[PDB]
């Protein structure tokens, strides 16, 4: 409106086909400048992190990975996005991040509405195995 700004000063608002609302506060929910895959990677960690090393010659799998997480990386919730066929290959690989779906840039300002749920593609160097 132009009705209160009567001061000489209108609102610096872009008001944008994509950002009419609220989409243009909102960094797709990551609240943080940070590679947090490394990070979540150490969280990995924390339910032991099988050396990427291995799975290349063990259990290879690019898949993508979205999931609901906790401000602590608690796993709260997980849908398999998108899977480049990982059959033997699954079982392992998600037993490690499905069950260790974690959380270690705290995104507070991301999950207000209710939680993070975001897509992250998990690699494992795959070659052409679950063959």
Same mark, same amino acid.
């Given at each position: 409106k132009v009705?209160?700004?009567s001061?000489?000063?209108?609102?610096?608002?872009?008001?944008?086909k994509?950002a009419?609302?609220?989409?243009?506060? %909102?960094?797709?929910?990551? $609240? @943080?400048?940070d590679?947090w895959?490394?990070? !979540?990677?150490?969280?990995?960690? &924390?339910?032991?992190?099988?050396?990427?090393?291995?799975?290349?010659?063990?259990?290879?799998?690019?898949?993508?990975?979205?999931?609901?997480?906790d401000?602590q990386?608690?796993?709260?919730?997980? %849908?398999?996005?998108?899977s $480049? @066929?990982?059959?033997?290959?699954?079982?392992? !690989?998600?037993?490690?991040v499905? &069950?260790?779906?974690?959380?270690?840039?705290?995104?507070?300002?991301?999950?207000?509405?209710?939680?993070?749920e975001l897509?992250?593609?998990?690699d494992?160097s795959?070659?052409?195995?679950?063959?």
């Open positions: 009705q209160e700004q001061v000489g000063a209108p609102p610096p608002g872009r008001a944008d994509t009419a609302p609220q989409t243009r506060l %909102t960094p797709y929910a990551q $609240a @943080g400048e590679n895959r490394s990070r !979540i990677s150490g969280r990995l960690n &924390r339910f032991k992190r099988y050396p990427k090393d291995a799975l290349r010659l063990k259990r290879q799998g690019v898949g993508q990975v979205r999931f609901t997480l401000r990386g608690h796993v709260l919730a997980v %849908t398999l996005v998108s $480049a @066929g990982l059959p033997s290959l699954d079982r392992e !690989i998600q037993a490690l499905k &069950r260790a779906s974690p959380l270690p840039t705290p995104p507070a300002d991301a999950y207000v509405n209710g939680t993070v897509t992250l593609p998990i494992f795959l070659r052409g195995a679950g063959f």
